[model samples]
Target: VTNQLQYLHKVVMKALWKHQFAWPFRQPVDAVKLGLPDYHKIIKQPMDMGTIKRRLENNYYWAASECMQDFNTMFTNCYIYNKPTDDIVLMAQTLEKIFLQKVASMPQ
Candidate 1:
């Protein structure tokens, strides 16, 4: 990826990690407690350039890395879209399912 695209990818991954992984959902039941507005409306929104830059500046390194992973997954899954807005919902759902399954299979 070009430098610009790489930067954008980092920002997106950070936003996703923040919304999906870092946030607390203590149990599967907590997932249901999250409303449509929380998941569908807010989580699906695209991360803006300013937010991304701020996140990077704030040293949210893990979030930045996660965003890059998310970008790669979206690119691989739906290359035709090429923009996060075009695939935000699908990307979020895909990541959520993948992470949840991983968590489920983890040894306690």
Candidate 2:
């Protein structure tokens, strides 16, 4: 893969991980400590690394869907104070561009 695509992939993965671990009881350090084995044990199977990779590769779709699902919860949070801001819009657009560009440059 090209460096640009790799960079974008890294960014998206970080963002997606952040989104995943942002739940009330889900902390990033806890995630790292718990790791895949714990996750698989919880789900009662070995985790598929390929599936995880594919999910991250297509994370723009996942992130958008997650945002839609959690929009009300996020908006009403004390941190956000029930208002959408310009910064949130910019961040979403930037992630979208990065995702599209990486997908376009990927090998067929």
Candidate 3:
């Protein structure tokens, strides 16, 4: 919604929606055309452990919310497609990584 989102979206996109997210997407548009960005579109890219530890350490809750979003996405994908393929596997792995990242960050 503001200039700040450009970098923020880029950072989150790498963790939350970094891979194979286009099946449900209408079209992959640039940030400018994306227009304010849907929270749905703007999520799923998993934050790296290092980055989360550095900039996002104070926002463990934010990471937690994104982790839930990931699980829900996986469940929804299974429900719709009736197949849990490599993407599901990868999603699960990423989800685990995010949870670890979140847990590791919360105490320090």
Evaluate all candidate structures by whole-model CA lDDT and list the values in order: 0.41, 0.37, 0.40
Instruction: Show the lowest summed lDDT stretch of 10 residues, model 3.
Output: 21-30
Candidate 3 displacement at residue 54 in angstroms: 22
For all predicted structures, in order, the TM-scores are 0.25, 0.28, 0.25
In candidate 3, what are the lDDT values of residues 1-108, reduced to their tens digit? 222222333344344444444232312223455343443354444223233323333444343445345444543433343245646445545554654454344421
Residue 50 lDDT, candidate 3, scale 0-100: 38
Give the Cα-based TM-score of candidate 3 against the true structure.
Answer: 0.25
The runs of at least 3 residues in candidate 2 whose Cα sits more than 4 Å from the true structure, single-residue gaps closed, are 1-85
> With candidate 2 superimposed using the best TM-score fit, by how many Å does residue 47's alpha carbon deviate from the native?
19
* Candidate 2 least-lDDT 10 residues: 74-83
Ranked by lDDT, the better of candidates 2 and 3 is: 3
Candidate that scores best on lDDT: 1
lDDT of 3: 0.40
Over 4 Å off in model 3, which ranges? 1-14, 17-87
Count of backbone clashes for each model? 3, 0, 8
Q: After aligning candidate 1 to the native by TM-score, how far in Å is the CA of 18 from where it should be?
A: 25
